[PDB]
Write an enzyme that holds these catalytic residues in place. Structure first.
Site, PDB file in Angstrom:
ATOM      1  N   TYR A 156     116.659  14.352  -1.429  1.00  0.00           N
ATOM      2  CA  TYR A 156     117.759  13.895  -0.586  1.00  0.00           C
ATOM      3  C   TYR A 156     117.219  13.168   0.640  1.00  0.00           C
ATOM      4  O   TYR A 156     117.776  12.160   1.074  1.00  0.00           O
ATOM      5  CB  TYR A 156     118.646  15.066  -0.150  1.00  0.00           C
ATOM      6  CG  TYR A 156     119.306  15.822  -1.285  1.00  0.00           C
ATOM      7  CD1 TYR A 156     119.355  15.295  -2.570  1.00  0.00           C
ATOM      8  CD2 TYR A 156     119.890  17.062  -1.064  1.00  0.00           C
ATOM      9  CE1 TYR A 156     119.957  15.989  -3.604  1.00  0.00           C
ATOM     10  CE2 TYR A 156     120.494  17.762  -2.091  1.00  0.00           C
ATOM     11  CZ  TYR A 156     120.527  17.221  -3.357  1.00  0.00           C
ATOM     12  OH  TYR A 156     121.128  17.916  -4.383  1.00  0.00           O
TER      13      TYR A 156
ATOM     14  N   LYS B 199     115.229  22.206  -3.131  1.00  0.00           N
ATOM     15  CA  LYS B 199     114.704  22.087  -4.489  1.00  0.00           C
ATOM     16  C   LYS B 199     113.379  21.333  -4.567  1.00  0.00           C
ATOM     17  O   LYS B 199     113.059  20.522  -3.699  1.00  0.00           O
ATOM     18  CB  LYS B 199     115.730  21.392  -5.387  1.00  0.00           C
ATOM     19  CG  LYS B 199     117.151  21.893  -5.213  1.00  0.00           C
ATOM     20  CD  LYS B 199     118.106  21.157  -6.134  1.00  0.00           C
ATOM     21  CE  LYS B 199     119.546  21.395  -5.726  1.00  0.00           C
ATOM     22  NZ  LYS B 199     119.843  20.832  -4.380  1.00  0.00           N
TER      23      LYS B 199
ATOM     24  N   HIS C  91     114.553  21.277  -9.648  1.00  0.00           N
ATOM     25  CA  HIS C  91     115.672  20.342  -9.649  1.00  0.00           C
ATOM     26  C   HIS C  91     116.050  19.876 -11.055  1.00  0.00           C
ATOM     27  O   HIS C  91     117.232  19.786 -11.388  1.00  0.00           O
ATOM     28  CB  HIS C  91     115.355  19.133  -8.766  1.00  0.00           C
ATOM     29  CG  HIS C  91     116.571  18.442  -8.233  1.00  0.00           C
ATOM     30  ND1 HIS C  91     116.553  17.685  -7.081  1.00  0.00           N
ATOM     31  CD2 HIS C  91     117.845  18.396  -8.692  1.00  0.00           C
ATOM     32  CE1 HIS C  91     117.762  17.203  -6.854  1.00  0.00           C
ATOM     33  NE2 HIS C  91     118.563  17.618  -7.817  1.00  0.00           N
TER      34      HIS C  91
ATOM     35  N   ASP D 158     122.952  23.702   1.191  1.00  0.00           N
ATOM     36  CA  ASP D 158     122.171  23.318   0.019  1.00  0.00           C
ATOM     37  C   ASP D 158     121.612  21.905   0.156  1.00  0.00           C
ATOM     38  O   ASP D 158     122.367  20.941   0.287  1.00  0.00           O
ATOM     39  CB  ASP D 158     123.026  23.421  -1.247  1.00  0.00           C
ATOM     40  CG  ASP D 158     122.233  23.156  -2.515  1.00  0.00           C
ATOM     41  OD1 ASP D 158     121.838  24.132  -3.185  1.00  0.00           O
ATOM     42  OD2 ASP D 158     122.009  21.971  -2.843  1.00  0.00           O
TER      43      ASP D 158
END
Lengths: 271, 273
Positions: A45, A70, A103, A40
Protein backbone atom coordinates in the site's frame (compact mmCIF):
# COMPACT_ATOMS: atom_id res chain seq x y z
CA UNK A 1 -17.64 -6.60 19.29
CA UNK A 2 -14.67 -8.94 19.67
CA UNK A 3 -13.79 -12.33 18.18
CA UNK A 4 -11.50 -15.02 19.60
CA UNK A 5 -8.69 -16.48 17.50
CA UNK A 6 -7.41 -20.03 18.03
CA UNK A 7 -4.51 -18.54 20.00
CA UNK A 8 -7.17 -17.00 22.26
CA UNK A 9 -6.23 -13.50 21.10
CA UNK A 10 -9.16 -11.13 20.60
CA UNK A 11 -9.64 -9.27 17.32
CA UNK A 12 -12.07 -6.40 16.55
CA UNK A 13 -14.67 -7.69 14.08
CA UNK A 14 -14.75 -4.25 12.46
CA UNK A 15 -11.68 -2.44 11.16
CA UNK A 16 -10.45 0.30 8.85
CA UNK A 17 -8.84 -0.77 5.58
CA UNK A 18 -6.23 1.27 3.84
CA UNK A 19 -5.28 1.76 0.25
CA UNK A 20 -2.46 3.18 -1.82
CA UNK A 21 -0.74 11.19 0.14
CA UNK A 22 -1.83 12.22 3.60
CA UNK A 23 -5.14 10.60 2.76
CA UNK A 24 -3.99 7.59 4.79
CA UNK A 25 -3.41 9.89 7.75
CA UNK A 26 -6.88 11.37 7.24
CA UNK A 27 -8.65 8.02 7.41
CA UNK A 28 -6.90 6.36 10.36
CA UNK A 29 -7.05 9.40 12.65
CA UNK A 30 -10.72 9.94 11.80
CA UNK A 31 -11.39 6.24 12.36
CA UNK A 32 -9.61 5.98 15.72
CA UNK A 33 -11.65 8.87 17.13
CA UNK A 34 -14.78 7.36 15.58
CA UNK A 35 -14.50 4.16 17.59
CA UNK A 36 -12.25 1.93 15.47
CA UNK A 37 -9.81 -0.33 17.31
CA UNK A 38 -8.63 -2.10 14.17
CA UNK A 39 -6.41 -0.80 11.36
CA UNK A 40 -5.51 -2.95 8.34
CA UNK A 41 -2.60 -2.05 6.05
CA UNK A 42 0.23 -3.63 4.05
CA UNK A 43 3.68 -2.81 2.70
CA UNK A 44 2.44 -2.84 -0.82
CA UNK A 45 0.00 0.00 0.00
CA UNK A 46 2.89 2.31 0.84
CA UNK A 47 1.01 4.03 3.64
CA UNK A 48 2.59 2.23 6.61
CA UNK A 49 4.56 5.43 7.15
CA UNK A 50 1.33 7.42 7.38
CA UNK A 51 -0.65 4.76 9.14
CA UNK A 52 1.61 4.67 12.15
CA UNK A 53 1.73 8.39 12.86
CA UNK A 54 -2.05 8.41 12.94
CA UNK A 55 -1.82 5.81 15.68
CA UNK A 56 0.25 8.14 17.81
CA UNK A 57 -1.17 11.63 17.20
CA UNK A 58 -4.33 10.76 19.15
CA UNK A 59 -3.34 8.94 22.32
CA UNK A 60 -5.38 5.78 22.43
CA UNK A 61 -2.85 3.44 24.13
CA UNK A 62 -1.17 0.97 21.77
CA UNK A 63 -2.47 -2.20 23.44
CA UNK A 64 -6.06 -1.11 22.76
CA UNK A 65 -5.66 -1.04 18.98
CA UNK A 66 -5.39 -3.95 16.56
CA UNK A 67 -2.81 -3.40 13.81
CA UNK A 68 -2.61 -5.60 10.71
CA UNK A 69 -0.03 -5.52 7.92
CA UNK A 70 1.01 -7.97 5.20
CA UNK A 71 4.13 -9.39 3.55
CA UNK A 72 4.31 -8.69 -0.18
CA UNK A 73 4.91 -11.41 -2.78
CA UNK A 74 8.38 -10.26 -3.86
CA UNK A 75 9.52 -10.58 -0.24
CA UNK A 76 8.51 -14.22 0.24
CA UNK A 77 11.19 -16.54 1.58
CA UNK A 78 12.53 -16.92 5.12
CA UNK A 79 15.22 -14.24 5.47
CA UNK A 80 13.50 -11.79 3.12
CA UNK A 81 10.35 -12.07 5.25
CA UNK A 82 12.31 -11.30 8.42
CA UNK A 83 13.55 -7.92 7.17
CA UNK A 84 10.47 -7.04 5.14
CA UNK A 85 8.73 -7.38 8.48
CA UNK A 86 11.27 -5.13 10.21
CA UNK A 87 10.92 -2.56 7.43
CA UNK A 88 7.14 -2.75 7.81
CA UNK A 89 7.69 -2.55 11.56
CA UNK A 90 9.91 0.53 11.43
CA UNK A 91 7.62 2.19 8.88
CA UNK A 92 4.65 1.78 11.24
CA UNK A 93 6.76 3.13 14.10
CA UNK A 94 5.94 0.11 16.26
CA UNK A 95 7.80 -2.98 17.47
CA UNK A 96 4.72 -5.18 17.49
CA UNK A 97 2.03 -5.80 14.91
CA UNK A 98 -1.10 -7.62 16.03
CA UNK A 99 -1.65 -9.49 12.76
CA UNK A 100 0.84 -10.37 10.03
CA UNK A 101 -0.45 -11.97 6.83
CA UNK A 102 0.89 -13.54 3.66
CA UNK A 103 -0.70 -11.24 1.08
CA UNK A 104 -0.88 -13.77 -1.76
CA UNK A 105 -0.18 -17.43 -2.53
CA UNK A 106 3.07 -17.81 -4.46
CA UNK A 107 3.64 -21.56 -4.24
CA UNK A 108 3.77 -24.22 -1.53
CA UNK A 109 7.50 -23.92 -0.85
CA UNK A 110 7.40 -20.12 -0.83
CA UNK A 111 4.43 -20.23 1.54
CA UNK A 112 6.02 -22.54 4.12
CA UNK A 113 9.39 -20.79 4.18
CA UNK A 114 7.59 -17.46 4.51
CA UNK A 115 5.33 -18.87 7.22
CA UNK A 116 8.45 -20.33 8.82
CA UNK A 117 9.60 -16.75 9.41
CA UNK A 118 6.07 -15.91 10.59
CA UNK A 119 6.42 -18.57 13.29
CA UNK A 120 9.88 -17.58 14.53
CA UNK A 121 8.65 -13.98 14.75
CA UNK A 122 5.59 -15.26 16.61
CA UNK A 123 7.82 -16.85 19.24
CA UNK A 124 9.86 -13.65 19.58
CA UNK A 125 6.61 -11.87 20.44
CA UNK A 126 6.93 -9.38 17.60
CA UNK A 127 3.58 -10.51 16.17
CA UNK A 128 0.45 -11.51 18.07
CA UNK A 129 -1.41 -13.41 15.38
CA UNK A 130 -0.35 -14.93 12.08
CA UNK A 131 -2.35 -15.95 9.04
CA UNK A 132 -2.71 -15.59 5.29
CA UNK A 133 -4.55 -13.65 2.60
CA UNK A 134 -6.09 -14.81 -0.69
CA UNK A 135 -5.49 -18.44 0.26
CA UNK A 136 -7.82 -21.12 -1.09
CA UNK A 137 -8.70 -24.51 0.40
CA UNK A 138 -5.76 -26.52 -0.96
CA UNK A 139 -3.51 -23.62 0.02
CA UNK A 140 -4.79 -23.77 3.60
CA UNK A 141 -4.69 -27.58 3.71
CA UNK A 142 -0.93 -27.43 3.16
CA UNK A 143 -0.55 -24.90 5.98
CA UNK A 144 -2.56 -27.12 8.33
CA UNK A 145 -0.50 -30.22 7.55
CA UNK A 146 3.03 -28.82 7.27
CA UNK A 147 3.11 -25.91 9.73
CA UNK A 148 3.52 -26.02 13.51
CA UNK A 149 1.54 -22.93 14.50
CA UNK A 150 -1.82 -23.31 12.68
CA UNK A 151 -3.06 -20.30 10.62
CA UNK A 152 -5.43 -17.99 12.50
CA UNK A 153 -6.69 -15.64 9.79
CA UNK A 154 -7.55 -15.93 6.09
CA UNK A 155 -8.27 -12.53 4.56
CA UNK A 156 -10.17 -12.95 1.29
CA UNK A 157 -12.52 -11.06 -1.02
CA UNK A 158 -15.97 -11.64 0.46
CA UNK A 159 -19.21 -9.76 -0.16
CA UNK A 160 -22.88 -10.18 -1.05
CA UNK A 161 -22.14 -11.32 -4.62
CA UNK A 162 -19.20 -13.52 -3.60
CA UNK A 163 -20.37 -14.84 -0.25
CA UNK A 164 -17.84 -17.70 0.01
CA UNK A 165 -19.94 -20.08 2.12
CA UNK A 166 -17.88 -23.13 1.15
CA UNK A 167 -14.59 -21.42 1.98
CA UNK A 168 -16.10 -19.96 5.15
CA UNK A 169 -17.21 -23.37 6.40
CA UNK A 170 -13.79 -24.89 5.75
CA UNK A 171 -12.07 -22.14 7.74
CA UNK A 172 -14.49 -22.41 10.68
CA UNK A 173 -14.07 -26.19 10.78
CA UNK A 174 -10.29 -25.79 10.89
CA UNK A 175 -10.53 -22.94 13.41
CA UNK A 176 -9.45 -20.30 10.90
CA UNK A 177 -10.97 -16.84 11.31
CA UNK A 178 -12.13 -15.70 7.88
CA UNK A 179 -11.59 -12.00 7.22
CA UNK A 180 -13.37 -10.17 4.40
CA UNK A 181 -11.79 -7.46 2.29
CA UNK A 182 -13.67 -5.54 -0.40
CA UNK A 183 -16.87 -5.95 1.64
CA UNK A 184 -18.52 -3.16 -0.35
CA UNK A 185 -17.41 -4.82 -3.60
CA UNK A 186 -14.59 -2.30 -4.10
CA UNK A 187 -14.81 -0.55 -7.48
CA UNK A 188 -17.93 -2.58 -8.29
CA UNK A 189 -19.85 -0.94 -5.45
CA UNK A 190 -22.53 0.38 -7.82
CA UNK A 191 -23.69 -3.20 -8.38
CA UNK A 192 -24.21 -3.34 -4.62
CA UNK A 193 -25.70 0.15 -4.31
CA UNK A 194 -28.21 -0.49 -7.10
CA UNK A 195 -29.22 -3.93 -5.82
CA UNK A 196 -32.96 -4.05 -5.13
CA UNK A 197 -32.78 -6.77 -2.47
CA UNK A 198 -30.29 -4.76 -0.40
CA UNK A 199 -32.20 -1.49 -0.80
CA UNK A 200 -35.34 -3.10 0.52
CA UNK A 201 -33.59 -4.40 3.61
CA UNK A 202 -31.87 -1.03 3.98
CA UNK A 203 -35.22 0.78 4.10
CA UNK A 204 -36.35 -1.80 6.65
CA UNK A 205 -33.75 -1.01 9.32
CA UNK A 206 -33.39 2.73 8.60
CA UNK A 207 -29.81 2.09 7.46
CA UNK A 208 -27.78 2.44 4.27
CA UNK A 209 -27.06 -0.45 1.89
CA UNK A 210 -23.34 -0.55 2.78
CA UNK A 211 -24.31 -0.72 6.46
CA UNK A 212 -26.44 -3.80 5.78
CA UNK A 213 -23.64 -5.33 3.71
CA UNK A 214 -21.22 -4.70 6.58
CA UNK A 215 -23.69 -5.88 9.22
CA UNK A 216 -24.34 -8.99 7.12
CA UNK A 217 -20.72 -10.08 7.55
CA UNK A 218 -20.97 -9.45 11.30
CA UNK A 219 -23.99 -11.76 11.43
CA UNK A 220 -21.85 -14.49 9.85
CA UNK A 221 -19.15 -13.84 12.47
CA UNK A 222 -16.76 -12.60 9.79
CA UNK A 223 -14.22 -9.84 10.42
CA UNK A 224 -14.89 -6.97 8.03
CA UNK A 225 -12.60 -4.13 6.98
CA UNK A 226 -14.64 -1.73 4.80
CA UNK A 227 -12.31 0.48 2.76
CA UNK A 228 -12.86 4.27 2.78
CA UNK A 229 -10.87 7.54 3.12
CA UNK A 230 -13.95 9.76 2.91
CA UNK A 231 -14.20 11.00 6.55
CA UNK A 232 -17.91 10.59 7.32
CA UNK A 233 -18.64 7.35 5.47
CA UNK A 234 -15.92 5.95 7.70
CA UNK A 235 -18.32 7.17 10.38
CA UNK A 236 -21.28 5.35 8.82
CA UNK A 237 -19.39 2.11 8.13
CA UNK A 238 -18.68 1.87 11.86
CA UNK A 239 -22.29 2.57 12.82
CA UNK A 240 -23.49 -1.04 12.60
CA UNK A 241 -23.88 -2.07 16.24
CA UNK A 242 -27.27 -0.54 17.04
CA UNK A 243 -29.40 -2.92 14.97
CA UNK A 244 -29.57 -6.57 13.93
CA UNK A 245 -30.63 -8.56 10.86
CA UNK A 246 -33.19 -11.35 11.17
CA UNK A 247 -33.47 -14.73 9.43
CA UNK A 248 -35.55 -13.35 6.56
CA UNK A 249 -32.88 -10.71 5.92
CA UNK A 250 -30.09 -13.31 5.88
CA UNK A 251 -32.31 -15.46 3.68
CA UNK A 252 -32.74 -12.62 1.19
CA UNK A 253 -29.11 -11.47 1.17
CA UNK A 254 -28.15 -15.11 0.58
CA UNK A 255 -29.69 -15.01 -2.90
CA UNK A 256 -27.60 -11.97 -3.88
CA UNK A 257 -24.60 -14.27 -4.43
CA UNK A 258 -23.48 -14.54 -8.07
CA UNK A 259 -20.04 -16.08 -7.61
CA UNK A 260 -18.56 -13.31 -9.73
CA UNK A 261 -15.13 -12.76 -8.17
CA UNK A 262 -13.68 -9.28 -8.70
CA UNK A 263 -10.03 -9.75 -7.72
CA UNK A 264 -7.40 -12.01 -9.28
CA UNK A 265 -7.85 -15.79 -9.11
CA UNK A 266 -6.04 -17.45 -6.19
CA UNK A 267 -3.61 -19.48 -8.30
CA UNK A 268 -3.10 -17.01 -11.11
CA UNK A 269 -0.94 -14.37 -9.47
CA UNK A 270 2.30 -13.27 -11.18
CA UNK A 271 3.12 -10.08 -9.29
CA UNK B 1 -4.14 -33.99 -33.78
CA UNK B 2 -5.21 -35.89 -30.71
CA UNK B 3 -4.14 -36.47 -27.12
CA UNK B 4 -4.57 -39.71 -25.19
CA UNK B 5 -6.33 -39.75 -21.83
CA UNK B 6 -5.15 -41.91 -18.93
CA UNK B 7 -7.24 -44.82 -20.24
CA UNK B 8 -5.47 -44.71 -23.62
CA UNK B 9 -8.59 -43.26 -25.25
CA UNK B 10 -7.81 -40.67 -27.92
CA UNK B 11 -9.35 -37.20 -27.90
CA UNK B 12 -9.08 -34.61 -30.72
CA UNK B 13 -7.13 -31.71 -29.21
CA UNK B 14 -9.48 -29.28 -30.96
CA UNK B 15 -13.27 -29.33 -31.08
CA UNK B 16 -16.35 -27.21 -31.73
CA UNK B 17 -17.90 -25.47 -28.75
CA UNK B 18 -21.68 -25.21 -28.63
CA UNK B 19 -23.59 -22.58 -26.65
CA UNK B 20 -27.31 -22.37 -25.89
CA UNK B 21 -28.57 -20.62 -29.02
CA UNK B 22 -31.62 -20.50 -31.30
CA UNK B 23 -33.20 -22.95 -33.77
CA UNK B 24 -30.87 -24.77 -36.20
CA UNK B 25 -27.98 -22.42 -35.39
CA UNK B 26 -26.50 -25.25 -33.34
CA UNK B 27 -27.38 -27.74 -36.07
CA UNK B 28 -25.73 -25.72 -38.84
CA UNK B 29 -22.61 -24.98 -36.79
CA UNK B 30 -21.91 -28.65 -36.06
CA UNK B 31 -21.99 -29.71 -39.71
CA UNK B 32 -20.19 -26.57 -40.90
CA UNK B 33 -17.50 -27.70 -38.46
CA UNK B 34 -17.67 -31.41 -39.32
CA UNK B 35 -17.28 -30.58 -43.02
CA UNK B 36 -14.40 -28.27 -42.11
CA UNK B 37 -12.47 -31.12 -40.51
CA UNK B 38 -13.73 -31.13 -36.93
CA UNK B 39 -13.98 -34.56 -35.31
CA UNK B 40 -14.83 -33.30 -31.82
CA UNK B 41 -18.12 -31.79 -30.64
CA UNK B 42 -18.69 -30.38 -27.15
CA UNK B 43 -22.23 -30.00 -25.79
CA UNK B 44 -24.24 -30.18 -22.55
CA UNK B 45 -27.80 -30.71 -21.33
CA UNK B 46 -28.05 -27.09 -20.14
CA UNK B 47 -27.33 -25.90 -23.69
CA UNK B 48 -30.50 -27.62 -24.85
CA UNK B 49 -28.99 -28.44 -28.23
CA UNK B 50 -28.26 -32.15 -27.74
CA UNK B 51 -31.11 -32.79 -30.17
CA UNK B 52 -29.78 -30.55 -32.95
CA UNK B 53 -26.18 -31.62 -32.36
CA UNK B 54 -27.04 -35.32 -32.48
CA UNK B 55 -28.99 -35.06 -35.73
CA UNK B 56 -26.25 -33.01 -37.40
CA UNK B 57 -23.88 -35.88 -36.64
CA UNK B 58 -26.18 -38.45 -38.27
CA UNK B 59 -26.79 -36.53 -41.49
CA UNK B 60 -23.08 -35.76 -41.95
CA UNK B 61 -22.40 -39.19 -43.48
CA UNK B 62 -19.35 -39.41 -41.21
CA UNK B 63 -18.79 -42.66 -39.22
CA UNK B 64 -19.81 -42.34 -35.56
CA UNK B 65 -16.59 -43.77 -34.10
CA UNK B 66 -14.55 -41.06 -35.83
CA UNK B 67 -16.41 -38.26 -34.06
CA UNK B 68 -15.68 -37.35 -30.43
CA UNK B 69 -18.89 -36.34 -28.64
CA UNK B 70 -18.80 -34.73 -25.20
CA UNK B 71 -21.84 -33.82 -23.13
CA UNK B 72 -22.15 -32.77 -19.51
CA UNK B 73 -24.37 -33.46 -16.53
CA UNK B 74 -26.11 -30.39 -15.10
CA UNK B 75 -26.06 -29.33 -11.43
CA UNK B 76 -29.71 -30.20 -10.74
CA UNK B 77 -29.17 -33.83 -11.74
CA UNK B 78 -26.24 -34.59 -9.42
CA UNK B 79 -26.72 -37.75 -7.39
CA UNK B 80 -26.42 -41.43 -8.34
CA UNK B 81 -29.98 -42.25 -9.43
CA UNK B 82 -30.61 -38.84 -10.98
CA UNK B 83 -27.35 -38.99 -12.93
CA UNK B 84 -28.11 -42.37 -14.53
CA UNK B 85 -31.44 -40.99 -15.75
CA UNK B 86 -30.06 -37.64 -16.91
CA UNK B 87 -27.45 -39.56 -18.90
CA UNK B 88 -30.04 -41.65 -20.73
CA UNK B 89 -31.89 -38.43 -21.53
CA UNK B 90 -28.67 -36.97 -22.94
CA UNK B 91 -27.96 -40.21 -24.79
CA UNK B 92 -31.43 -40.39 -26.36
CA UNK B 93 -31.48 -36.70 -27.30
CA UNK B 94 -28.12 -37.09 -29.03
CA UNK B 95 -29.44 -40.12 -30.91
CA UNK B 96 -26.33 -42.00 -29.82
CA UNK B 97 -26.16 -44.93 -27.42
CA UNK B 98 -22.56 -44.45 -26.38
CA UNK B 99 -20.87 -41.17 -25.44
CA UNK B 100 -17.16 -40.41 -25.84
CA UNK B 101 -16.83 -38.13 -22.80
CA UNK B 102 -19.16 -37.32 -19.91
CA UNK B 103 -18.40 -34.48 -17.49
CA UNK B 104 -19.68 -33.13 -14.19
CA UNK B 105 -20.50 -29.55 -15.16
CA UNK B 106 -19.96 -27.83 -11.80
CA UNK B 107 -18.86 -28.64 -8.25
CA UNK B 108 -21.81 -28.93 -5.87
CA UNK B 109 -20.24 -30.43 -2.75
CA UNK B 110 -17.97 -33.44 -2.28
CA UNK B 111 -20.78 -35.90 -1.54
CA UNK B 112 -22.73 -34.79 -4.61
CA UNK B 113 -19.55 -35.06 -6.67
CA UNK B 114 -18.70 -38.59 -5.52
CA UNK B 115 -22.30 -39.82 -5.74
CA UNK B 116 -22.51 -38.46 -9.26
CA UNK B 117 -19.13 -39.87 -10.23
CA UNK B 118 -20.06 -43.31 -8.91
CA UNK B 119 -22.83 -43.22 -11.50
CA UNK B 120 -20.26 -42.16 -14.11
CA UNK B 121 -18.16 -45.15 -13.08
CA UNK B 122 -21.12 -47.52 -13.46
CA UNK B 123 -21.76 -46.16 -16.95
CA UNK B 124 -18.06 -46.50 -17.79
CA UNK B 125 -18.05 -50.14 -16.71
CA UNK B 126 -21.18 -50.72 -18.79
CA UNK B 127 -19.40 -49.27 -21.82
CA UNK B 128 -21.84 -46.39 -22.29
CA UNK B 129 -19.10 -43.79 -21.78
CA UNK B 130 -15.61 -44.11 -23.22
CA UNK B 131 -14.17 -41.48 -20.88
CA UNK B 132 -15.29 -39.78 -17.66
CA UNK B 133 -14.18 -36.49 -16.12
CA UNK B 134 -15.24 -33.19 -14.58
CA UNK B 135 -15.62 -29.50 -15.35
CA UNK B 136 -15.06 -26.34 -13.28
CA UNK B 137 -13.29 -28.41 -10.62
CA UNK B 138 -10.51 -26.74 -8.65
CA UNK B 139 -7.53 -28.47 -7.04
CA UNK B 140 -9.14 -29.52 -3.74
CA UNK B 141 -12.15 -30.80 -5.68
CA UNK B 142 -9.84 -32.96 -7.78
CA UNK B 143 -7.94 -34.17 -4.70
CA UNK B 144 -11.20 -35.57 -3.35
CA UNK B 145 -11.95 -37.42 -6.54
CA UNK B 146 -8.33 -38.71 -6.86
CA UNK B 147 -8.67 -40.11 -3.35
CA UNK B 148 -12.14 -41.62 -3.58
CA UNK B 149 -12.72 -42.58 -7.22
CA UNK B 150 -12.11 -46.14 -8.37
CA UNK B 151 -11.75 -44.92 -11.94
CA UNK B 152 -9.59 -41.75 -11.76
CA UNK B 153 -10.75 -38.54 -13.55
CA UNK B 154 -9.54 -38.24 -17.14
CA UNK B 155 -10.56 -34.71 -18.12
CA UNK B 156 -11.00 -31.38 -16.33
CA UNK B 157 -12.70 -28.76 -18.50
CA UNK B 158 -12.08 -25.28 -17.09
CA UNK B 159 -12.01 -21.66 -18.25
CA UNK B 160 -8.55 -21.18 -19.73
CA UNK B 161 -7.24 -18.41 -21.98
CA UNK B 162 -4.38 -15.94 -22.37
CA UNK B 163 -5.56 -13.77 -19.47
CA UNK B 164 -6.35 -16.74 -17.22
CA UNK B 165 -3.65 -19.27 -18.07
CA UNK B 166 -4.08 -21.59 -15.06
CA UNK B 167 -0.48 -22.85 -14.93
CA UNK B 168 -0.91 -24.06 -11.35
CA UNK B 169 -4.07 -26.06 -12.05
CA UNK B 170 -2.55 -27.33 -15.30
CA UNK B 171 0.56 -28.61 -13.51
CA UNK B 172 -1.57 -30.31 -10.85
CA UNK B 173 -3.69 -32.08 -13.47
CA UNK B 174 -0.61 -33.22 -15.41
CA UNK B 175 0.91 -34.61 -12.21
CA UNK B 176 -2.31 -36.54 -11.60
CA UNK B 177 -2.77 -37.65 -15.22
CA UNK B 178 -5.78 -35.42 -15.85
CA UNK B 179 -6.21 -33.89 -19.31
CA UNK B 180 -6.98 -30.21 -18.85
CA UNK B 181 -9.54 -28.92 -21.34
CA UNK B 182 -9.98 -25.23 -22.07
CA UNK B 183 -13.39 -23.67 -22.62
CA UNK B 184 -13.83 -19.98 -23.41
CA UNK B 185 -10.44 -20.00 -25.18
CA UNK B 186 -11.37 -16.75 -26.93
CA UNK B 187 -12.44 -15.25 -23.59
CA UNK B 188 -16.11 -15.74 -24.55
CA UNK B 189 -18.26 -12.60 -24.31
CA UNK B 190 -15.11 -10.77 -23.22
CA UNK B 191 -13.86 -11.24 -26.79
CA UNK B 192 -12.71 -7.61 -26.84
CA UNK B 193 -9.76 -7.82 -24.41
CA UNK B 194 -8.25 -10.56 -26.56
CA UNK B 195 -8.74 -8.83 -29.91
CA UNK B 196 -7.41 -5.58 -28.46
CA UNK B 197 -4.35 -7.23 -26.92
CA UNK B 198 -1.19 -5.65 -28.32
CA UNK B 199 0.97 -8.71 -27.68
CA UNK B 200 -1.58 -11.06 -29.27
CA UNK B 201 -1.96 -8.64 -32.18
CA UNK B 202 1.79 -8.41 -32.77
CA UNK B 203 2.67 -12.11 -32.81
CA UNK B 204 -0.24 -12.59 -35.22
CA UNK B 205 1.85 -10.55 -37.68
CA UNK B 206 4.62 -13.12 -37.39
CA UNK B 207 2.63 -16.13 -38.56
CA UNK B 208 0.12 -14.30 -40.78
CA UNK B 209 -2.73 -15.51 -38.58
CA UNK B 210 -5.68 -14.00 -36.75
CA UNK B 211 -5.62 -13.27 -33.01
CA UNK B 212 -8.08 -16.10 -32.21
CA UNK B 213 -6.05 -18.62 -34.26
CA UNK B 214 -3.12 -17.61 -32.07
CA UNK B 215 -4.83 -18.07 -28.70
CA UNK B 216 -6.00 -21.47 -29.91
CA UNK B 217 -2.53 -22.55 -31.07
CA UNK B 218 -1.00 -21.39 -27.79
CA UNK B 219 -3.27 -23.84 -25.98
CA UNK B 220 -2.34 -26.51 -28.53
CA UNK B 221 1.33 -25.89 -27.78
CA UNK B 222 0.61 -26.43 -24.08
CA UNK B 223 -0.94 -29.81 -24.91
CA UNK B 224 -4.34 -28.52 -23.78
CA UNK B 225 -7.60 -29.59 -25.43
CA UNK B 226 -9.35 -26.51 -26.81
CA UNK B 227 -13.01 -26.03 -27.76
CA UNK B 228 -13.78 -22.58 -29.23
CA UNK B 229 -17.51 -21.80 -29.49
CA UNK B 230 -18.97 -20.30 -32.67
CA UNK B 231 -22.00 -20.31 -34.97
CA UNK B 232 -20.35 -18.32 -37.76
CA UNK B 233 -19.14 -20.81 -40.43
CA UNK B 234 -16.17 -18.66 -41.49
CA UNK B 235 -14.68 -18.28 -38.01
CA UNK B 236 -15.31 -21.99 -37.44
CA UNK B 237 -12.96 -22.72 -40.34
CA UNK B 238 -10.47 -20.10 -39.15
CA UNK B 239 -10.47 -21.53 -35.62
CA UNK B 240 -9.61 -24.91 -37.15
CA UNK B 241 -6.84 -23.64 -39.42
CA UNK B 242 -4.33 -24.01 -36.61
CA UNK B 243 -2.24 -27.01 -37.69
CA UNK B 244 -0.18 -25.37 -40.44
CA UNK B 245 2.14 -23.36 -38.19
CA UNK B 246 3.91 -23.37 -34.82
CA UNK B 247 4.83 -21.04 -31.96
CA UNK B 248 8.47 -20.68 -30.93
CA UNK B 249 9.90 -20.18 -27.44
CA UNK B 250 9.95 -16.38 -27.53
CA UNK B 251 6.32 -16.37 -28.67
CA UNK B 252 5.28 -18.59 -25.77
CA UNK B 253 7.18 -16.43 -23.29
CA UNK B 254 5.57 -13.36 -24.84
CA UNK B 255 2.11 -14.89 -24.48
CA UNK B 256 2.99 -15.87 -20.91
CA UNK B 257 3.13 -12.23 -19.77
CA UNK B 258 -0.39 -11.36 -20.95
CA UNK B 259 -1.81 -13.37 -18.05
CA UNK B 260 -3.80 -11.16 -15.68
CA UNK B 261 -5.61 -13.73 -13.56
CA UNK B 262 -8.99 -12.09 -14.10
CA UNK B 263 -11.39 -15.05 -14.08
CA UNK B 264 -14.48 -14.44 -16.20
CA UNK B 265 -16.86 -17.18 -15.07
CA UNK B 266 -18.29 -18.23 -11.69
CA UNK B 267 -15.79 -18.93 -8.91
CA UNK B 268 -15.33 -22.67 -8.29
CA UNK B 269 -16.88 -22.68 -4.81
CA UNK B 270 -19.67 -20.12 -5.22
CA UNK B 271 -22.17 -21.92 -7.46
CA UNK B 272 -25.76 -21.68 -6.25
CA UNK B 273 -27.35 -22.59 -9.58
Amino acid sequence: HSVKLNNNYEMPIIGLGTFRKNDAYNAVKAALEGGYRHIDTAMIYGNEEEVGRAIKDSNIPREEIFVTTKLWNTDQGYEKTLEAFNTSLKNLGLDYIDLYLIHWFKGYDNALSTYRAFETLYEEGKVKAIGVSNFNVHHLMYLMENAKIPPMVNQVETHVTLQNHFLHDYCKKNNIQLEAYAPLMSHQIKDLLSNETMAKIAKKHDKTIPQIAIRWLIEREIVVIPKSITPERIVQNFDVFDFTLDEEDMKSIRSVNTGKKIFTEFDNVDY
